[PDB]
Homo-oligomer: 213 residues x 5
């Protein structure tokens, strides 16, 4: 259709978020559970720097994080004059899951939020930003072992669920471009109880071990 | 019970802040005293780096800070159509305590202010952001000793009070993930008078000592 | 007239202010944008060995050249709007989401304060300074580095990319360094990614430098 | 007398700044001379790093800067319902002196501009932000000697004057927490003519010498 | 004569820029040529670091850049009640020359854009921001040789012209505070043709050589 109508479609969809704010689960009727599909694709190691004279180190990684979830506020009927299958939207203009790298040595991993998300007419959002992750590794016997723990900061399992995208319970290596040998690569979804709260939080925990250089 | 109603509730609660601004103690009626509950949870040590050739060092820590206080502006009756016991709100849309790390070697500790706070119907706010803390430690005889001093920057004890969350006067280790041995761990609340002002300011002072690597 | 120029800009940008900058730059039928892309190397900031292995982080200063057609920004160049071109800030218009895929950081950085020039026919030419950081191979006194550029979310049906002036190599028009260039080639390829059926256009540059 | 009236007071005072902007000397009526009271309190040294192999070094300091001046735009009569002796305001919502660290090795010192200023009913503003200062020091014979030159960037002495807070011509040690021996500590106010301008500029020049570690 | 009237004048001057935007040469009638006077004042060297094991180095400098030009939009008759001969204005609220350091090893030199410009009633603007400049130098034979190339990014000589301030074709030493011996100091204004464009661009090229430490 018209490129005009595509922009108008975006503005109409975003009007709700502009008027009501981006905070809160993406439901206007019965509040349901958001199931977020999550993938972590490793590209390369930036650095691994021993901490002091001990066996630990700070591992800084370049990755691409993949996230998808359904936002019912962003649905539209794909017929004229809005006969579009999808539209691109800035992630800072919509609700996004507050999934953080809990064990970051910094505040959190950093995502490139200038990267656009794509929303399909059925409300499915797919957002695949580049990411920098910094964690505390153990460096022993020429092996560097690092873990990554992801979960929603404030939403428990009855509010935000998380599952591995495409059921792939592993660091994805589709974009891997480094020379380092991968020695261990596994991941687990677990529901973990925190002191704050009655309901468990979903943790996606990845274990990655690389041969030291 | 509707998601729409939760979003409208938030907008109604935040209208006061939007109209009149976030600045000023969080009271509709006679300005009283905010009682902040404060907790510090150590996750890990990013780095400890000797300053020059002396016995001092810059210690950089990853922690989670727990903050709770009452905002009487954010109160509502949990009855239909606003039958919600709590809601999530961005901390940058409401008043938050100006609690700073006084002895930071930088301007202040940094908190992840993208982290959402939860507000309960009685106005209780609970906000638990990740934090990075950089302080000057003493590194002597296989021990690294660091202190952390927290307090409201501008509000005296008659305006903002602070007490240890759950009355635990210590660094909390519920999220501790590092391999360092903790040799000392204590904290104390004191009211301190400074040259600027007649009224005292509340200081939460934590002392932490770790076995060196 | 100066006033007419500012008003022309405001008229042209009114669409973007009202509808937003997102979405392919078409007002009528949505076609394909064809971005012309150029990379001009100015200098190496640093190349730092990673650990004790044969890789290094290479940090480069370059100038990126981008041109495309935005049909929303067209005007008839007749009085009082008798202007062949105007200057516009890149953050006021759509710009292609071309990223350095293999950056060791989130992305390359471009100086987005640099103004773009838009001609009356809607052609935008924007030539920002850039800093690029990639993982190189440093072995046998040769530092080998690659750069992969492409639209992040738009496939070849939406955003295509071709070398500016058909020159499939790092441009040396602004080269101001002492390092000897041992290899300098580039390729346009359409690559299929896991996410999507339609291929994505990758501009891949190979650069090798004599080590210092 | 209530929290709502305090915010309405703030909104009324700030209306002038919102409608007309923060630029310009802070006078409601005739433009007079601002007299800034200035204090510098050294907390600690973050680092001192030799430059090359010479006698100079980059000294990076954590300090607290104290600033007071009068803003006649922000005056009110403390009579009910605006019976407040003071209110807190963000420094980015009002005029603040453009006092910069002239000899910074970076663009300028950095101040924590999230810290609130306090404005009293007579228009006196007191703002005491933490600060990070980085200057070029001389490091010779076991002594590190550093200087700090502060002054308004664009306002001459007939527009913005500066004097030492409490008339103390020295680096204040009220907040000093470091283990370094202070060997020299002095300050002097002088009026200095720069080539740009007929009228002189007020320079607050502090000299600090510390024993090397 | 009064503080509120000075703000009203600024608001009226800036109205054009707020309504029409800051982009485009500062003319409302016939579009002419802007003549920028440019001065570079070296204060000190932050660092000079050898690149690898070769003969080049990264030189990081603190300077003050002096810029003057005429903005015919910001003119006014200095008569009551706008009897002000100059006003201070934020450089982010008016057109400024897009003069960049072409050979910066970073994206560009950085200027402190919080620093106010002063506009005189005849439209002459004078803006003198602190600056940090990072360039690639040659370090050989105990001499560090560095060059600085400045010019407007998008405007050719027909649109923006540049000349040395006070006719001095050299790095100005009016603010020089460093101990380094300056062995070479010269500068040249040249019209350089670029591949993009028919009209030439004005380059101000400075040559500076220092004795190594
Ligand atoms: C406003 O609403 C909020 C949320 O509903 C509410 O906060 C909650 O209060 C309960 C009960 O006071 C807290 O439960 C406590 O948790 C801690 C740690 O788990 C315990 O130490 C407490 O133990 C009790 O027994 C102690 C000794 O006998 C007593 O000294 C103490 O007072 C306790 O009764 C207790 O289990 C809970 O932590 C919060 N929950 C949250 C999420 O905030 C608050 O009470 C309401 N405020 C008002 C003013 O009504
Ligand atoms: C929108 O309008 C703009 C402005 O008019 C327009 O930009 C112009 O494009 C033309 C044509 O591409 C440019 O003219 C050419 O520049 C190239 C430089 O590489 C020359 O090679 C061309 O010379 C010819 O002869 C060459 C061999 O000797 C041939 O290889 C070539 O095919 C040419 O026939 C020719 O001079 C012109 O420089 C710009 N103008 C400006 C001001 O930048 C743009 O093309 C329009 N956009 C679209 C999509 O049409
Ligand atoms: C505008 O309002 C401000 C804020 O109220 C006001 O500044 C304050 O002035 C008071 C009174 O001068 C100051 O309070 C004094 O501080 C000194 C030093 O600490 C004390 O010595 C004083 O105590 C007494 O003893 C003195 C000597 O014996 C007596 O001379 C005096 O009368 C006292 O009995 C006293 O507490 C206060 O420090 C400042 N506060 C600030 C933040 O500036 C200012 O004066 C007002 N300006 C105008 C023009 O009215
Ligand atoms: C637009 O207005 C601005 C601001 O007023 C104006 O710039 C200023 O011009 C004045 C006066 O022309 C300059 O002041 C002079 O500077 C020089 C060198 O420092 C001195 O020689 C001058 O001293 C006097 O004595 C001279 C004989 O020795 C006389 O010939 C001379 O007239 C003087 O009486 C005098 O101090 C000043 O440098 C600038 N200031 C700035 C910030 O630019 C500008 O000229 C006006 N533009 C136009 C086109 O009218
Ligand atoms: C929402 O719509 C999208 C687009 O149709 C659905 O995703 C595509 O589904 C097809 C058929 O299974 C797959 O081959 C594609 O891989 C999907 N496209 C993309 C871009 O991923 C999506 O499944 C729908 N969501 C729901 C919840 O039904
Ligand atoms: C549990 N959550 C926070 C919860 C909160 O802020 C909160 C909860 C309830 C009310 C107010 C605030 C507290 C701090 C820890 C954090 C953990 C993260 O979920 C998480 C869970 C599982 C894997 C990775 C990350
Ligand atoms: C006391 N406070 C500031 C007070 C102020 O800005 C202020 C006060 C009154 C008026 C105007 C400004 C001045 C600088 C020190 C700071 C200290 C912090 O409170 C604090 C106290 C205890 C532990 C941690 C932090
Ligand atoms: C393929 N693209 C993203 C596509 C996407 O986000 C997306 C697509 C469809 C829906 C939602 C999101 C996924 C992550 C990889 C990225 C790669 C980049 O294009 C690219 C291609 C070629 C050279 C350089 C860069
Ligand atoms: C003098 N001032 C600037 C003045 C200006 O921008 C200016 C003035 C008038 C018109 C246009 C610009 C020029 C550059 C130096 C700077 C110095 C600072 O004041 C200062 C003075 C004393 C101690 C510390 C700092
Ligand atoms: C020439 N200029 C840019 C011109 C442009 O963006 C442009 C021009 C015309 C249309 C669209 C974009 C291209 C990249 C190089 C740059 C150089 C700078 O002028 C300059 C010249 C002399 C000294 C310092 C700086």
């Amino acid at each position: 259709s018209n490129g005009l109508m595509a922009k108008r479609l975006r503005r109409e969809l975003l009007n709700t978020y502009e008027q009501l704010g981006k905070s809160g689960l993406p439901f206007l009727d019965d509040i349901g559970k958001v199931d977020v599909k999550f993938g972590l694709s490793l590209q390369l190691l930036k650095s691994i720097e021993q901490r002091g004279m001990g066996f630990n180190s700070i591992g800084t990684f370049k990755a691409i994080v993949k996230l998808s979830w359904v936002d019912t506020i962003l649905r539209w009927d794909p017929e004229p004059p809005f006969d579009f299958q999808k539209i691109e939207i800035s992630p800072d203009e919509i609700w996004t899951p507050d999934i953080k790298l809990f064990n970051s040595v910094d505040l959190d991993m950093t995502l490139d939020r200038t990267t656009q998300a794509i929303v399909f007419s059925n409300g499915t959002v797919l957002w695949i930003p580049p990411a920098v992750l910094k964690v505390l590794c153990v460096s022993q016997d020429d092996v560097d072992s690092c873990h990554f723990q992801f979960g929603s900061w404030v939403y428990s399992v009855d509010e935000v669920d998380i599952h591995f995208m495409d059921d792939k319970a592993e660091v994805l290596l589709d974009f891997y471009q480094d020379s380092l040998e991968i020695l261990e690569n596994s991941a687990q979804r677990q529901e973990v109880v925190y002191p704050c709260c009655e309901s468990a939080y979903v943790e996606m925990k990845y274990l990655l071990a690389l041969r030291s250089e």
